[PDB]
Amino acid sequence: QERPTFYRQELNKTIWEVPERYQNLSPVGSGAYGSVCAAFDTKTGHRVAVKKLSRPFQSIIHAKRTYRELRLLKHMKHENVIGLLDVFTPARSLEEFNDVYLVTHLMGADLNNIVKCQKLTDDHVQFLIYQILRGLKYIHSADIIHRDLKPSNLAVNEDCELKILDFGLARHTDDEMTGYVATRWYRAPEIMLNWMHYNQTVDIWSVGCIMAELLTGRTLFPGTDHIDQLKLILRLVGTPGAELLKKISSESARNYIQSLAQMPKMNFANVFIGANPLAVDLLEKMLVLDSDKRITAAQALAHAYFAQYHDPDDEPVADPYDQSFESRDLLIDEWKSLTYDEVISFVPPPLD
């Protein structure tokens, strides 16, 4: 219909101005460049997560980041990928347009919380990784690369359902609140130092790191610097041939590895003691340095580890996603104006 009635309050030391349909706002921590509140939605009867962007138009870099997130979120329509119930702004015109709120279904936790407060069975792992892969198939089908899969970017609820969020840039950073320390632990050797030679196969590495950690409860490669990170990896997957060692490492790192004795590949059945041998087998096809030999999201869905959940008919794909805008160099008000067109054009899901 026309414009809802708004109300105002103070959460996380800033004014939250939202439609009356959203009640009982409770802060549930930070998101990417913003922060998120749990709510009740009187329109649909569901509990929702509302994220308010934090000064979305303060600079060019940020204005473009805001556009990029809205476009992406508007496009993602899949059960295992965060998408939009609603997007709103309290402004009534472009001239007073400063704030952007985004609403999705409320998920209770992420895998970081889970892994640090309970043990998971093999059944738990089967379904959780099954979901990650299924969404990943969808995301990859659209010619999108996540780049930053890790436990904290996988949101979950009490029924053990899972959604992928917070897509990362092809960029290295040590800026505040970007999650840079943990991202390094799940990142594919080929993109540990630069983003010149990579493809979507980087996410499957990540998945492998995540799966292991769900099985054991421990971070698989918790390195302290790039040298220590590469060591820890090779120690498990064996030192590779010289051509490949140089694709996946720096001069200094390469020299460190060679100052050590050749490392053999470990048998993953001797590392992960007690594991379902199907679980080990799949890990063995994810965590390989040769990205071409890495099993893909599509294929892995058909693996026997997920026999209980696989169904090729209910594992949908995506409309490829148009990222051209990324090439434009604009001004704050220019991005902010594209961000406004997208707010106004937004159509919500049907009420079921």
């Binding site: 936790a109 998971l120 029924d159 590392v271 992960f272 003691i273 007690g274 594991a275 379902n276």
Partner: peptide
Amino acid sequence: VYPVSVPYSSTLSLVMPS
């Protein structure tokens, strides 16, 4: 060696932390 949390042998719930 990483021993698994719950050894394999021959509807799923998760406890939310708060």
